[PDB]
Amino acid sequence: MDDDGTGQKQIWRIEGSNKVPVDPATYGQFYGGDSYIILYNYRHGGRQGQIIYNWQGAQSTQDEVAASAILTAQLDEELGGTPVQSRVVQGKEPAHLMSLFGGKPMIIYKGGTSREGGQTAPASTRLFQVRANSAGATRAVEVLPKAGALNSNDAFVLKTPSAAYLWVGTGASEAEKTGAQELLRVLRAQPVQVAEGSEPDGFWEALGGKAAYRTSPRLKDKKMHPPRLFACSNKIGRFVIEEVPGELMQEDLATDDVMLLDTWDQVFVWVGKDSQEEEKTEALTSAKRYIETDTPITVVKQGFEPPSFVGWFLGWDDDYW
Ligand SMILES: [Ca+2]
Ligand SMILES: [Ca+2]
Ligand SMILES: [Ca+2]
């Protein structure tokens, strides 16, 4: 999409059965627990156009997904059936959508709203994982503030009532460091700059104590064969393996299948709890063959993943399943 993302946009959040305007001063910040509709009006190549992006946060509920479908059909009809329509799940945003925020990162908070609970309040201590893709599109995703949530490949922002830290993994890019700084501007906090390996005591204390975290030779590498994830299933009646594009999200791990994560110097074979034995056997055979055409093969089970695996994902919830 050659359009530059600087057209007029309106953003609404699904709240119950309605779409509700988002504060225009916070465009670019979204709750991961919610669904949104973005109406983007632009002009490119001498012609006007409109796109509706329907963005589904990773923790948004089925009720909100269904509500969004009604709301977008309504909007579509209101506009006379003119917009291009695009459905996007968190982590799978196209470059064009990432460009709508003036070069700022997409910031994804924990929580959101629901019919029952209303708007959740922010935690007093917060941790965000800041990751950029190869193209430079940057996401700052809120996670639980524990030492184990860190990964060497990315930048992190840690905000507490009394302090703020910008932790920079050895593998973190300048886009990630910049994105972390933009997040800190939104949080209205001035950071202590912390490099991986020289953390001050206050940093670990703020996280509830020092602990091992998500690291490996490849996670620590700054240069970047960037890791590829594959879904392995025999559900269609024969065994096949296909790639999972976009940012690597925990939801991409199919609990009824086997997943291959190739980090180049290692291939993980992740076994879903409801996957059949044959899917593991064939995934192991396929992985060995991939490797041999041109390296550890590490088997991991759902719910028992090692930090070296979990570090490649953008956010991880220990109680996801
Ligand atoms: Ca919600
Ligand atoms: Ca990174
Ligand atoms: Ca299966």
From Swiss-Prot:
Residue numbers spanned by region Actin-binding, Ca-sensitive: 1-321
Q: Where do the Gelsolin-like repeats lie?
A: 17-98, 138-204, 241-309
User: Could you say which residues bind Ca(2+) 7 here?
Assistant: N153, D154, E176
Report, as the record phrases it, the tissue specificity of this protein. Answer: Phagocytic cells, platelets, fibroblasts, nonmuscle cells, smooth and skeletal muscle cells.
Q: Where does Ca(2+) 8 bind?
A: D256, D257, E279
Residues with the modification N6-acetyllysine, per the entry, are K146
- Effect noted on mutating E279Q: Does not result in actin depolymerization activity in absence of calcium. Has actin depolymerization activity in absence of calcium
Q: Where does Ca(2+) 5 bind?
A: G33, D34, E64, T113
Residues with PTM Phosphothreonine: T295
Residues holding Ca(2+) 6: D76, G81, P83
Residues with the modification Phosphotyrosine, per the entry, are Y27, Y165, Y213
Query: Which disease does the UniProt record connect it to?
Result: Amyloidosis, hereditary systemic 4, Finnish type: A form of hereditary systemic amyloidosis, a disorder characterized by amyloid deposition in multiple tissues resulting in a wide clinical spectrum. AMYLD4 is due to gelsolin amyloid deposition and is typically characterized by cranial neuropathy and lattice corneal dystrophy. Most patients have modest involvement of internal organs, but severe systemic disease can develop in some individuals causing peripheral polyneuropathy, amyloid cardiomyopathy, and nephrotic syndrome leading to renal failure.
- Family membership noted in the UniProt record: Belongs to the villin/gelsolin family.
Q: What is the recorded function of this protein according to its Swiss-Prot or TrEMBL entry?
A: Calcium-regulated, actin-modulating protein that binds to the plus (or barbed) ends of actin monomers or filaments, preventing monomer exchange (end-blocking or capping). It can promote the assembly of monomers into filaments (nucleation) as well as sever filaments already formed. Plays a role in ciliogenesis.
Q: What is known of its domains?
A: Comprises six structurally related gelsolin-like (G1-G6) domains, that, in a calcium-free environment, are packed together to form a compact globular structure in which the putative actin-binding sequences are not sufficiently exposed to enable binding to occur. Binding calcium may release the connections that join the N- and C-terminal halves of gelsolin, enabling each half to bind actin relatively independently. G1 and G4 bind two Ca(2+) in a type I and in a type II manner. G2, G3, G5 and G6 bind only one Ca(2+) in a type II manner.
Q: How does it assemble?
A: Binds to actin and to fibronectin. Identified in a complex composed of ACTA1, COBL, GSN and TMSB4X. Interacts with the inactive form of EIF2AK2/PKR. Interacts with FLII.
The name this protein goes by in its record: Gelsolin
Task: Give the organism, scientific name.
Answer: Homo sapiens (Human)
At the highest ranks, the source species' classification is: Eukaryota, Metazoa, Chordata, Craniata, Vertebrata
User: Gene name?
Assistant: GSN
